[PDB]
Ligand binder design. Sequence first.
Ligand SMILES: Nc1ncnc2c1ncn2[C@H]1C[C@H](O)[C@@H](COP(=O)(O)O)O1
Ligand SMILES: Nc1ncnc2c1ncn2[C@H]1C[C@H](O)[C@@H](COP(=O)(O)O)O1
Ligand SMILES: Nc1ncnc2c1ncn2[C@H]1C[C@H](O)[C@@H](COP(=O)(O)O)O1
Lengths: 524, 524, 524
Amino acid sequence: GADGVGNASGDWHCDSTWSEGHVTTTSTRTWVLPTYNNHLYKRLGESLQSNTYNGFSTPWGYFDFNRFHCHFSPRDWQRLINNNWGMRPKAMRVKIFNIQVKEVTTSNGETTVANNLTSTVQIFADSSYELPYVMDAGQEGSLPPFPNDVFMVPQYGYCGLVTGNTSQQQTDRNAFYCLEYFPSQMLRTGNNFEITYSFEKVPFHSMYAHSQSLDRLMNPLIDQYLWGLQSTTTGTTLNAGTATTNFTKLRPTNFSNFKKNWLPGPSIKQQGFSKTANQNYKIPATGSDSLIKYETHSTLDGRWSALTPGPPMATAGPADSKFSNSQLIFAGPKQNGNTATVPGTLIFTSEEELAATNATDTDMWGNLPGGDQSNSNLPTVDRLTALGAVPGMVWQNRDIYYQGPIWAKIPHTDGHFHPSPLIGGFGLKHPPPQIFIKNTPVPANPATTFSSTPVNSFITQYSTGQVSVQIDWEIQKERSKRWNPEVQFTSNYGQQNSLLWAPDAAGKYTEPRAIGTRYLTHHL
Amino acid sequence: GADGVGNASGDWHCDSTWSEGHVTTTSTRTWVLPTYNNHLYKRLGESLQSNTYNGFSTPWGYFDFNRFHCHFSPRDWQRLINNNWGMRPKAMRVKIFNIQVKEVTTSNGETTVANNLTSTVQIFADSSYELPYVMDAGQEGSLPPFPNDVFMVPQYGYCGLVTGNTSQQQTDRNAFYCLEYFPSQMLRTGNNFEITYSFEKVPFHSMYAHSQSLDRLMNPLIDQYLWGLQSTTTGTTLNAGTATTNFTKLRPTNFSNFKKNWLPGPSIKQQGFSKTANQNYKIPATGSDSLIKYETHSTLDGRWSALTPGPPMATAGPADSKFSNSQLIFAGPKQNGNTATVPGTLIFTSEEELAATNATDTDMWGNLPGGDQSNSNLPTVDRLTALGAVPGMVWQNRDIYYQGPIWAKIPHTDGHFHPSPLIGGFGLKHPPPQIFIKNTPVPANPATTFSSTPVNSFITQYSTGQVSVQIDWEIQKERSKRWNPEVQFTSNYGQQNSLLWAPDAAGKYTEPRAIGTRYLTHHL
Amino acid sequence: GADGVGNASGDWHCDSTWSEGHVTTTSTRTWVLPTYNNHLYKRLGESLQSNTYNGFSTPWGYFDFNRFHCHFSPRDWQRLINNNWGMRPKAMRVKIFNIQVKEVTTSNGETTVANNLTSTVQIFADSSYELPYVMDAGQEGSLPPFPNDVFMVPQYGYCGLVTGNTSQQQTDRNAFYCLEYFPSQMLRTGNNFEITYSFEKVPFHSMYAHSQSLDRLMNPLIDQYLWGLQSTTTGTTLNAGTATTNFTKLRPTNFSNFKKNWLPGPSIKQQGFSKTANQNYKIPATGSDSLIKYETHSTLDGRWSALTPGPPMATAGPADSKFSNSQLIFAGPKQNGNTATVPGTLIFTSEEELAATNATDTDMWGNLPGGDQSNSNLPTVDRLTALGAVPGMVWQNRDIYYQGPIWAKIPHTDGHFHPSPLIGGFGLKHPPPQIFIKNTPVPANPATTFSSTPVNSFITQYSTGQVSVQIDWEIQKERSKRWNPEVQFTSNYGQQNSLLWAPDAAGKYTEPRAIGTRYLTHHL
Ligand SMILES: Nc1ncnc2c1ncn2[C@H]1C[C@H](O)[C@@H](COP(=O)(O)O)O1
Ligand SMILES: Nc1ncnc2c1ncn2[C@H]1C[C@H](O)[C@@H](COP(=O)(O)O)O1
Ligand SMILES: Nc1ncnc2c1ncn2[C@H]1C[C@H](O)[C@@H](COP(=O)(O)O)O1
C-alpha cells in the first residue's frame, strides 16, 4: 500500500451479503486521532483499597471492533436472529487508509488548521499477543453503530498486578511495555494499512430459547420402573401419623420425584434489588458499608470484585421490578450522564430464557438436609446457595446482544473451566489482534546549540482517516419440525413522531432498546 | 421390504455370539399396537405446583429397547460381567415385520376379531432427533426380558416448558410437534421395516470395583520427604499444654496426614432413611411438609426436583437398614402394585463399591474451619456438605444394572459436565433413534352428502407383529496380575421350589434380584 | 402403478424443504369417498329471482388443494413471509394410493363393514379443461390444514347459464357433461394414480407493504420547476376578496398540488358497516329491500351479484369497528355454524396496506367539478365514486392469506383486464387440473329373467385411501437497504391454557387467526 498525495488510498465499503449459512458484514467509519499524554508514557497508580490499581497510560490509540452493532445493522441483526439457531465469527480483515495529518496553529485569538503532508502516522498489530489485551473489557472505543458517525480513537492504557489490597505500590514483577519497542509501519497520506485474521474454531452461539424444561423431559403418559420413598408416616401432618415406610412406583402427575439423568448447572446466589426506590434497604455507595459489601463478590489477594456478569443463571425479567447484577444494563436513548436515578432511563437485559436449564440468580440452587434425620430429630433444611460443577450438570450460557461484546481473550493460565466470556461472546485463545496507531512526534523549532536533553517542543498535530472491518460469519439455519409459529423480533414500536432506530429531527442516532438473539426455539 | 400376503416378512432371531472382545446380542419379541387417544393429539396440562407440567399426548406408539435385559439373558449378563473390565454399545440394527392388522367388531354381546388385509400401519425413525426424546427417562415400555412375553407398545407423549411453579399455562415458546408432518413408511402385511444405527464412540463402562483406596495409594513402608504441622501444643488435651509448633516428617502409620495428589470427587449430601419404619421422622407424602421438602433437591424456575439418582456417591449397602435416594430401587418379584410398605418386597441397588474414590451419600465430603484460629480462639468446625469440581478430583461413576437403562441423550445445551447419565448408562449426543409406529385410521361408513367436518367414525383396529434388535457390543477382557481369586456373580440361591430366573409353575417369569457389573477388580 | 393386495401402494410424505429461492411443500392426507347421488346424475335447478341457478350434480367426487394451508404449516408460512418479497407456484405432483374399497351391510339392528377386494374405484384428470372448473370458487373441499385429519371428498356439481333473472329454465345452449364419457383409470387395492403439472409463468405475489405513499414520491427539500394556480381571490373567505390570478412555483410544504406522474388505481365505492349492531341502518336479509339492494353490486342479465371481493382497494382495519365487503371474513375458532351475530366470533381480513397506492373502499376515488366555474357561478363539487382504468394509474393487488385460495382459472373469454383473482391468488389460464374420483357401481343380486331396464339394486359401498400433493414454490429473497428493523409475524399470543395453532385438550385443531403475507417492506 503506497501511492500519491492526490490519490485516495482506499474506498468506502459498507456491504451486507447473506447466503446459505455464511454472512459477510463489511463496514467503514471515519476516525480522529489526537496526541495522547502529550507524546509520553505515564505511570498510573492510585491506592484505593480494593479499587487499588497501577499501570501505565500510553501515547498510542487503538481500533476496537468488539461490539456487534459495529458490523450488523438493525435489519441485519433481525435477519440473523429470526432464522438461525446459531452463528460465529470465521474470518476478519481490517484496513486503515486515506490518512490525513493536520497541524494546528492557535492564533492570537482562535485556532487555525493546516495539512502537514510529510507528517507520518504509525500502525502495527500486536499479533503475537505480547501486550495486555484491552479490547475485551466491555469498555468504550469500538466503532459507532451509525455508519455516518465520526469517532475518536481510544487511548491505550493497561494495568499491572496489584500486590496487596492496600497500596498501588508495584513489585519487581510489575512490567512496563513500550510500544516503540515494536516494529511499526510508518504512513503518510497515500500510504495505507491492511491485515487479515482468522477466528479459531469456536462453538456456535445459541440464538434460541429452550422448549422443554430440564425437569420435565419424560413421557407424561408413563410410569418409571424405578421406586422411591414417598413418605415416612401416615398423616398429612408433619411429625404425626402411624409412621411407615411408604414406597411408590413413581408414576405420572408426580414428576418432581421422577429419577432424572441431568441436573441444572452451577450457580452462585446474587442479591436482588427493586427498581421501585423504597423496596430496597438503603445501603450507601461509599463508606464502610458500601453496596459492594452486601452484594455477592469474589476476593482476590484481599481485594473485592463484584460477581458482576457472573455465572450463567436464569435472571429476572426485563420488565420485572426486580433486577440484579447478572443482568446487563445499557444506557437508555435519552440517558447522557455517568449517573441516573430513574430505572426507566436505562436499558435492562434479561436471561429469563435460561430458566429451562439454569438456576435462578436471586433464588438458590436447591436444598440440603443440615444433618441426619432420626426418629427423634428432623434436621434443619439448609440452603444450597452456591454450587460448583457436579457430574451430570448441563446449562445454557448467557445470551449475546446487538450492542454487546463479540469476543474476549481467554486468560493465559494453565487450566480454566468452560471458557465462555461471562459478559458474553466468543472465548478465543488468540482473538482478533489489537491494532495500535499513534501520530508521529514532530519537533518544533530547535535550539541552535546542542543539548543532551530529550525534546519538548513539538508541533501540535492530529490525524484522521477511514477504517473498514470485514468479518465473515458462519451461521446455521434452523430446521425444526415445530408446528406452531415462533416468536420473532418485530418492530411493533407503534406510532411515533420520529422513527425509531433512525436519526431524530436533530440528526442524532440513538438505540431504542437492546436486542437479544434467542427468539427461535429448540427442544432439549 | 415388500412381498405377498401368505409370506412371512421376516424370521425369529434370538442369537447370542461371544468372541474376542465383541459380543452380539440379537432378540425378537411380539408386540401389540392399539389406537391411542382414539386417533387424535391431545394437549396435556395440569397445574400441580412443582409437579406442574404441560405437553401433548400423541396417537403414536414407539419401540424402546433402552434396558439391558432386553438384550442379554441371565447367563449372558453373567458371562459379560465375570470376565470383562468394561463394555459399550457399538452398533444397532432394528427391524419390524410380519405386520398383521386386525379390525374388531363388538357383537350384540361380545367382541369378534377379523383380519383387515388392506389396512396399513405407519413407521418412521426420528433420526434427525427433531422431537422430544423420551426413550431415556427410565420409564416403562422397553421390551420384556423374557423372550416369549408379548408386550404392548407405549404411547408417545412429550412435555413442554413449564414457565413458573404455579400454572401449567403455556407461553409462545411452548411448541407442538405433529408426527404426521414427517415422512412415514406405510405398511401392509407383506411389507416390513428395517434400520441401522452406529453408536458414537463412548467410554467403556467400568464393570469392576477398586482394590486400592484413594487415600491409601502409597508405600506403607516409607517416609515422605515432606513435612507438616502435627500439633500446636504439648498435652493430650485440647487447649492445654506448653504450646509449641510440632512439625513431623510424615512417616508410616500416619497416612491420614500424608501429602496426596488426588482428592475424592464432587458430592452433595443426601438424607438417609431407615427401612425399619420407626427409625425415621414421620414426614407425610402430601402437605406443606411433604417428604420432598426435607430431602435434598434442586430448584428450577421455582419448581422442586428430588436430587434422585444424583451425583456419583458411595452409597449404603443393599442389606443395610439405611437407604436413600442415590440408590436405584426396582420392584420385587412378588411386588405388583404402585405402592408398598415392606422394604423386603422391593429390590435395593447399591454403590457401596464407590467408597474407594467417592464420598458417602448420607455423610459429607469433609470439613472446613469456620473461621481463623487464634491463641484466643478455636473456630467452629464446619461441615462440607456439598462440593463441586476442584482441580485434582477423581471419581467413579454409578454402576450399570441388568435391568437398568443402557443409554441416554445428552441435553442440547452449550456446555455440561462429565456427561454420564445419572440413572446410569452411556451418554450419547445422538443415541439410538426413536422409532414411531401407529395404525392408520380407517373411516367407517360415511355420510352420503358432503361435509367439511373432519371424520369421526372409524373402524376399530389394532395391529400386532414381531420386532428384533441386534446390538454389537465391544467388550474388553481384563488381564490383571491379581493372585487371589476374584468375586463373581454366582447362582447360590440354594434349594428352591420353582427354579429362579425361570418361569414358575403358573408360567410367570419374574426377576429375583438386581445384577450389577462390578464383580471384577482393578487397582487405582 | 400396479402390485398386490398385501402391499402398500405408496408411502406417507409430509416434507418441507427450503433453500436459495425455492421451497417444496409435500403433504399427505387420508380421505373417504361415499356414493354420491346414489350413483346418478341429477339435473339441478331452482328459480330464485337473482339466485336463480341451474345445472347438474354428479356421482363423482374431486380433490381440491386450492388452499395455502393445505401445503404450508404455521411455522412455514411464517418462514415464507418474514424473509421473501414474493413467491409463486412452479410445479405440482399429485398421487392417490392405498385404495381400500369397503362394502357395508346394515344388520337387523346396526351396520357392519367389510372389505370388497375386487371392487374398483375410478380416477381421471380433466387436463384438457373440458368441464366446468370448480376448484377456484373459494368453496370447501380442499384438504385439512392439520396433517392428521381425515377428510371427505367433495361432490362434483356444476352450474349452467341462467337465461333471465326469473326462471331457472334452460335453453338450447345449456349443456350437460357426463364424466363417464371420459377415459378414466380403474383401480383396485394395489393400484394407484399419479400425475404431474407445471404452473404457467405467473407474477410473484407481493408479500410486502409499501413504504413511500404514491402522493409523496418527491424530494421534500426542493421546489418543482412547474407552476400552478393557487387561488382566484384575495381573502381567506370563499367568494370574497379582490379577485386575482395567483400562481405559485409549487414548492415544499405544499405537495398536494405538486404535479405528479402517477394516479391511484381504479375503484368502486363500497358500503361500510359497523360491527357495533346499532350503528347500521336496519336492512333485512330477505324482502324487497334486502341488504343486497343497498350494497354495491353488479348486474348480469338482470341478475344481481354482490361486488364482494371486488377491485383492489385500501380497506378498513382488522380492529376497526367499520368493515365491509372487499374484506375477507373467515370463521373464528369457536364459530361452528352457518350463522353468527357476534363479530368477535369471526375473523376479519384487511387490505389496510393498500392505502399507499389504492383508494379506500368505503370513501371515494376523488372529486370532480359538476359544471364550469364562472365569475357568477361556483359549480357543485361532485363525487368520483367509481372510476375505471386511466393512463398513469398504478395499484397493488389484494393480499394472499394462509387459509386463502392459491389460484383460479382465468375465464375463457376474448379479453379481460389485469387477471388477478379478486378473492386473491394466481390467475392461470390453465391451472392445476381437477382430479375426479368415484367408486364404481356394484350390482346387487339380479333378476333371473332378462330386463331392458337400467340396474337399481347396488351393493352399498365407500372407499378410503391417502393422497399427497407436492408443489414446488419459487420464492424471492428481499435485499433492501432499509436500516430500521422490519415488522414480522410473531407469536405473541401471550400465556395460554392450550397452546395456539395446536390441538386442544379435546384433540381439536383450530386456526386462531388469519395470516397475511405483507409484513416486509419495499418502497415505490
Ligand atoms: N466461547 C467459547 N470458547 C471456547 N470454548 C467454549 C466456549 N464456549 C463453550 N466452550 C466449551 C467448548 C469445549 O467444551 C470447551 C473447552 O475448554 P478447554 O479448556 O479449551 O478444554 O469449552
Ligand atoms: N457416558 C459418557 N458419554 C460421554 N462422555 C462421557 C461419558 N462418561 C464419561 N464421559 C467423559 C468422557 C470425556 O472426559 C467427557 C467429555 O464431555 P464433553 O462435554 O463432550 O467434552 O466426559
Ligand atoms: N395472477 C395473474 N395472472 C396473470 N396475469 C397477472 C396476474 N396478476 C397480474 N397480472 C398481470 C401480468 C400482465 O401485466 C397481465 C396480462 O394480462 P393478459 O390479458 O394475459 O395480457 O396481467
